[PDB]
Structure formats: C-alpha cells, structure tokens
Amino acid sequence: SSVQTAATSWGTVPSIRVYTANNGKITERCWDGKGWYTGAFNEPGDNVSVTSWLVGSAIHIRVYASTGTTTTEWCWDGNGWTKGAYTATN
Amino acid sequence: SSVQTAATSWGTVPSIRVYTANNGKITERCWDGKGWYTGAFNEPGDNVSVTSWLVGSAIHIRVYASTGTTTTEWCWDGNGWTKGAYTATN
Amino acid sequence: SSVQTAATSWGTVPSIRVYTANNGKITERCWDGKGWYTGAFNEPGDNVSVTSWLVGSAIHIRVYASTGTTTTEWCWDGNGWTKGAYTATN
Numbered sequence: 001s002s003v004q005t006a007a008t009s010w011g012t013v014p015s016i017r018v019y020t021a022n023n024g025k026i027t028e029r030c031w032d033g034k035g036w037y038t039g040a041f042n043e044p045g046d047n048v049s050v051t052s053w054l055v056g057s058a059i060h061i062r063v064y065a066s067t068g069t070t071t072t073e074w075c076w077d078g079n080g081w082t083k084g085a086y087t088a089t090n
Numbered sequence: 091s092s093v094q095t096a097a098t099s100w101g102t103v104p105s106i107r108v109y110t111a112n113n114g115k116i117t118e119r120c121w122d123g124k125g126w127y128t129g130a131f132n133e134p135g136d137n138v139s140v141t142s143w144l145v146g147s148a149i150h151i152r153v154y155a156s157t158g159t160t161t162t163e164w165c166w167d168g169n170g171w172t173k174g175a176y177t178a179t180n
Numbered sequence: 181s182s183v184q185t186a187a188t189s190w191g192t193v194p195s196i197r198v199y200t201a202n203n204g205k206i207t208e209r210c211w212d213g214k215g216w217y218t219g220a221f222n223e224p225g226d227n228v229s230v231t232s233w234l235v236g237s238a239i240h241i242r243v244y245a246s247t248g249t250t251t252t253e254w255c256w257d258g259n260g261w262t263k264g265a266y267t268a269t270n
C-alpha cells in the first residue's frame with residue numbers, strides 16, 4: 001500500500017520531522033543535522049498532517065492522525081507525546 | 091477512505107487551523123488558545139493542502155482544494171475567503 | 181480520482197510553492213509575487229509532502245516524494261534539486 005507523508009521543520013539549524021502513514025500506523029523519522037533516526041512518535045492513523053511552532057528555542061509539534069472519520073491530535077511540548085483537545089464531527 | 095487533513099499554525103499562542111477533506115467536503119477547525127471552534131471555511135474538495143504566513147501580526151492563509159485535476163486556491167487575507175489566481179494544467 | 185497537493189511559503193511577499201502529484205508524476209507551480217509559473221521540480225511520486233526554512237534570505241526546501249512504500253527526499257539549497265539523505269524502512 002502507498003504511504004502518505006507529512007513534514008515539518010524548525011530553526012536556522014534546522015530540525016526536520018517526517019511522518020509516514022502506512023498500514024494504519026504513523027511513524028516518525030527525524031533529522032537534527034547529524035543523520036536520520038527513528039523518532040518516539042508511533043500512533044495509529046491512515047492519514048497524517050503536522051504543524052509546529054517555536055516559543056523561543058522550545059519546539060511544539062501537533063500531529064493530526066485520522067482513521068475513518070476520527071482525527072486524533074498528538075502534542076509534543078518538550079516532554080513526550082500526549083493526546084490533545086482537538087475534536088471534529090466528521 | 092479516511093478523512094484527509096492539512097494543518098497550519100502561526101504566532102506563539104499559537105493559532106492553529108486544521109482543514110479536513112471528508113468525502114469531497116472541506117471544513118475548518120480553529121484554535122486561538124482557548125478551545126476549538128468551527129471556522130468559516132467550507133468548500134468542496136477531495137484533497138486539501140495549506141500554507142500560511144504573517145505580515146506583521148496579519149495572517150494570510152492559502153488553502154489548495156483539489157477535485158479531479160482542478161486545484162482551486164482559496165485565500166484568507168483578513169476579510170473573507172476569496173478564489174486566488176493559482177492555476178495548473180493537471 | 182483527484183490530484184494530491186502540498187504547499188509551502190516563505191517571507192512576506194510571499195513566495196509560494198505548490199507541488200501536485202498526478203498519475204505518478206509530481207510537478208511544481210511557483211509564485212514570487214508576480215504571477216504563477218512552472219517550477220524546475222519534476223520527480224516521480226504518487227504522494228507528496230514539503231517543508232522549507234530560511235537561512236537569512238536563502239530558502240531551503242525539502243520535498244518528500246513517495247511511490248508505493250518508498251519515500252525519496254529532494255533538496256533545494258540554491259543550486260537545483262538534489263537527492264537527499266532521507267531513508268525509511270516502510
């Protein structure tokens with residue numbers, strides 16, 4: 001099956017995160033200037049989007065993972081991934 | 091199919107906009123720091139992408155809504171959604 | 181079937197790049213404030229995502245083009261599109 005990706009980046013440095021949806025799972029590949037590695041993010045979804053923003057030098061990431069009509073938001077705010085408040089009535 | 095999303099964010103609060111394509115309909119959910127609400131954007135499209143940029147504190151959003159080989163650009167520039175000049179020969 | 185797009189933008193003009201996956205080919209439309217034109221980017225893919233960042237006034241673009249389970253990264257750093265180091269085990 002044909003993977004679907006989403007990407008975000010930050011910093012003059014920079015850092016890149018690439019999310020791939022495949023077989024109902026979204027996984028994460030990371031670049032911080034020194035090679036690609038597998039990130040901590042591992043959550044269910046058939047579809048993925050992402051956005052991120054800096055507050056000073058602190059990154060905040062939001063990943064929108066969708067299966068069927070249900071989209072779940074995942075939040076990185078410096079200390080692990082947690083489910084966000086996002087809802088929609090799809 | 092699953093729903094398909096696209097996300098953008100700006101500032102440090104931040105503001106977030108999440109666009110969802112659901113069986114050919116695109117809708118918008120918005121966060122400005124207190125809670126999610128349904129945004130004004132509601133247009134047809136089977137696929138969606140988005141980008142945004144600030145000019146000072148003024149946000150500009152471009153949503154690319156695709157049905158078949160026709161992509162329609164939708165523009166937010168402070169005063170409602172308008173069709174943009176984007177064309178492609180798909 | 182519908183085409184699938186990805187978009188990025190930078191600066192305050194702004195510059196915008198829209199990537200469209202259509203029948204296994206990804207092409208690029210560009211805006212730099214003065215009309216849409218067809219960009220140099222032409223690579224295979226059924227799925228596309230993009231991110232970009234500025235270093236001063238120099239843009240850096242990364243396009244993730246997927247065919248089946250294989251994602252290829254393409255890099256713009258001011259001298260044409262080049263192969264990126266991205267890998268994944270999908």
Ligand SMILES: O=S(=O)(O)c1cc2c(O)c(c1)Cc1cc(S(=O)(=O)O)cc(c1O)Cc1cc(S(=O)(=O)O)cc(c1O)Cc1cc(S(=O)(=O)O)cc(c1O)C2
Nearest residue numbers: 001002003021022023024025046226247248249250269270
């Ligand atoms: O990688 S290929 O593009 O050459 C390829 C295409 C198809 C294939 O069946 C395979 C490879 C073999 C294959 C690969 C994988 S995967 O490496 O994990 O992606 C999985 C499977 C498989 O037969 C099993 C499978 C899973 C799913 S899933 O429910 O989405 O996870 C769907 C399918 C599967 O065969 C159906 C399917 C979808 C697609 S599509 O490209 O997504 O439309 C192509 C092919 C398919 O068989 C047609």
Ligand SMILES: O=S(=O)(O)c1cc2c(O)c(c1)Cc1cc(S(=O)(=O)O)cc(c1O)Cc1cc(S(=O)(=O)O)cc(c1O)Cc1cc(S(=O)(=O)O)cc(c1O)C2
Nearest residue numbers: 028029030031034035036037038039040265266267268269
């Ligand atoms: O993709 S690359 O081939 O360019 C690459 C090569 C090396 C790298 O260190 C990395 C990428 C970054 C990297 C990625 C990963 S991943 O998450 O699995 O993708 C993991 C690591 C890492 O540095 C951490 C790591 C783990 C282990 S383990 O304890 O055995 O699991 C060993 C190593 C690690 O760096 C050593 C290592 C092995 C290898 S090898 O492929 O096994 O020869 C290459 C490189 C190495 O630094 C040299």
Ligand SMILES: O=S(=O)(O)c1cc2c(O)c(c1)Cc1cc(S(=O)(=O)O)cc(c1O)Cc1cc(S(=O)(=O)O)cc(c1O)Cc1cc(S(=O)(=O)O)cc(c1O)C2
Nearest residue numbers: 004046047068091092093094111112113114115136137182
């Ligand atoms: O839910 S299933 O995994 O069993 C499933 C997978 C595929 C299917 O084609 C169907 C079911 C049948 C089917 C279901 C629906 S739905 O009930 O509304 O979900 C819709 C369709 C369909 O053929 C028609 C359709 C719509 C769209 S959409 O307009 O973008 O929503 C896309 C597709 C459709 O076939 C393409 C498609 C996407 C996907 S994906 O998992 O979302 O990438 C899987 C399958 C697809 O045929 C492959």
Ligand SMILES: O=S(=O)(O)c1cc2c(O)c(c1)Cc1cc(S(=O)(=O)O)cc(c1O)Cc1cc(S(=O)(=O)O)cc(c1O)Cc1cc(S(=O)(=O)O)cc(c1O)C2
Nearest residue numbers: 091113114115135136137156157158159160181182183184
């Ligand atoms: O690839 S997509 O994810 O966009 C997709 C969306 C839909 C789908 O039903 C399919 C794929 C499956 C599918 C694929 C193809 S193929 O790429 O050519 O193999 C063809 C069809 C189909 O259902 C048949 C078909 C053709 C056409 S037309 O040639 O443009 O007239 C229209 C439709 C078809 O089902 C109706 C249709 C339109 C649209 S759209 O919103 O108008 O783009 C989305 C989906 C549709 O099923 C919903």
Ligand SMILES: O=S(=O)(O)c1cc2c(O)c(c1)Cc1cc(S(=O)(=O)O)cc(c1O)Cc1cc(S(=O)(=O)O)cc(c1O)Cc1cc(S(=O)(=O)O)cc(c1O)C2
Nearest residue numbers: 190191193195211212213220236237238239240257258259
């Ligand atoms: O060459 S020009 O000085 O006439 C020029 C200035 C600007 C422009 O937007 C363009 C040309 C159009 C243009 C062309 C191309 S090309 O097809 O490859 O020739 C590429 C771009 C572009 O905007 C994309 C682009 C590239 C780069 S760079 O590759 O890192 O040099 C920087 C920028 C781009 O938009 C940002 C930028 C900086 C500057 S600055 O004067 O350096 O601050 C002026 C203009 C800019 O668009 C403002």
Ligand SMILES: O=S(=O)(O)c1cc2c(O)c(c1)Cc1cc(S(=O)(=O)O)cc(c1O)Cc1cc(S(=O)(=O)O)cc(c1O)Cc1cc(S(=O)(=O)O)cc(c1O)C2
Nearest residue numbers: 223224252253254255256259260261262263264265266267
């Ligand atoms: O245009 S083509 O797709 O036909 C093409 C094929 C090959 C080529 O060598 C090139 C183009 C030229 C070329 C382009 C670039 S780019 O500017 O970055 O796009 C880079 C290179 C290059 O030869 C250098 C290079 C990179 C790598 S990488 O490690 O995978 O990034 C591998 C090679 C390179 O020469 C060896 C190589 C691999 C492959 S393969 O497709 O990976 O099997 C094809 C060709 C190769 O020369 C054979």
